Design a protein around this ligand. Structure first.
Ligand code: 0GQ
Length: 330
């Protein structure tokens, strides 16, 4: 079996992408953020504190006939930017663009951090990392992809994010009409529970390619691209006026400057990110200073290939026994 769903940017900056998901019987459609950097499927619901919901669509367990409370199970997660959510657990039917999985763990939020409440376009998350990161206690639960793996024509899923436009999430097959040239596969380390791989190097603009190993994770749930201090400093040095701002918390540049492209290595292949992709707008309404899409990871503890890098490629997440990552131009 297979499934295909359209993913849409939440705002004109591509800060995040939402995908419609059918939950329960009869279906209750919620727009979730697909996150390959987490392994929990949580949603706003009729249980969430009333004061913590501001326009999001909620899931109503009592309205679903397939819904069933997972007695004693609880969840609690906190993300890299500090956001947090927690609540109880249910099992129910979940369909993503045709692909149906019964008995999927649906984590119902009882508490959500203020950053979530302020975000009316995101109804919840669908984690696509490795099941080892699931926070359901005391009985860990499997992810949606893990649950469908056995029924898919191919234990894979693909990410095709668009720049200032809609994209596609496919489950169980490769659309050979969606990319150009060949697909380059690279080893994945599942040790930390992430889609962790190693880039082979980089280039700034038309500069010479630098051979250097960069260890990072493929995370659709992260907006920007976070690389080592040395790499990031070399990029912004090619932009007149750019500088690291203490007050803003990152690299900023004059809104009128042209950004050079950024190249990252996949094996012997190279993926090119257009400079337009790296512009994230005025730091503040009306400002002539703009925020950069490539920032330092010196503080994170790991490099992150977020949407900024991913949307420049057709990405294959091969969940075989020996998982791999596939990158192609498009
Ligand atoms: C089981 C935890 C799980 C693995 C967890 N995983 C993650 O945090 C990675 C995951 O991909 C999450 C998923 C996000 C979380 C926030 C809401 C949207 C989804 N990603 C991040 O945290 C990346 C940092 N945040 C982001 O990149 C958000 C994403 C966003 C976009 C639109 C609207 C709202 C949020 N955007 C931005 O920060 N920016 C974009 C806008 C730009 N103008 C400002 C910068 C984790 O590592 N948590 C850290 C953690 C906490 N506590 C402990 C004890 N250990 C930990 N490792």
């Amino acid at each position: 079996s297979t499934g295909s769903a359209t993913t849409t940017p939440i705002d004109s900056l591509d800060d995040a992408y939402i995908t419609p998901v059918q939950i329960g019987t009869p279906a209750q459609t919620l727009n979730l953020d697909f996150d390959t950097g987490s392994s929990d499927l949580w949603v706003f619901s009729s249980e969430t504190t009333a004061s913590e919901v501001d326009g999001q669509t909620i899931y109503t367990p009592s309205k679903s006939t397939t819904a069933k409370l997972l007695s004693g199970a609880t969840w609690s997660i906190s993300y890299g930017d500090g956001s947090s959510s927690s609540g109880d657990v249910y099992t129910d039917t979940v369909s993503v663009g045709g692909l149906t999985v019964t008995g999927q763990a649906v984590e119902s939020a009882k508490k959500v951090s203020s950053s979530f409440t302020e975000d009316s376009t995101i109804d919840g998350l669908l984690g696509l990392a490795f099941s080892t990161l699931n926070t359901v206690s005391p009985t860990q639960q499997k992810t949606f992809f893990d649950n469908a793996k056995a029924s898919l024509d191919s234990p894979v899923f693909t990410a095709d994010l668009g720049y200032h436009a809609p994209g596609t999430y496919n489950f169980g097959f490769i659309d050979t009409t969606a990319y150009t040239g060949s697909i380059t596969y690279t080893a994945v380390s599942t040790k930390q529970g992430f889609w962790e791989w190693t880039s082979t190097g980089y280039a700034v603009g038309s500069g010479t390619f630098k051979s250097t190993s960069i260890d990072g994770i493929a995370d659709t749930g992260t907006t920007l691209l976070y690389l080592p201090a040395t790499v990031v400093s070399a990029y912004w040095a090619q932009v007149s006026g750019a500088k690291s701002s203490s007050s803003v918390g990152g690299y900023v540049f004059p809104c009128s400057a042209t950004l050079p492209s950024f190249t990252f290595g996949v094996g012997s292949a190279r993926i090119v990110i257009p400079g337009d992709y790296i512009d994230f707008g005025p730091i503040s309404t009306g400002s002539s200073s703009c925020f950069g899409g490539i920032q330092s990871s010196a503080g994170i503890g790991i490099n992150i290939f977020g949407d900024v890098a991913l949307k420049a490629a057709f990405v294959v997440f091969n969940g075989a026994t020996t998982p791999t990552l596939g990158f192609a131009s498009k």
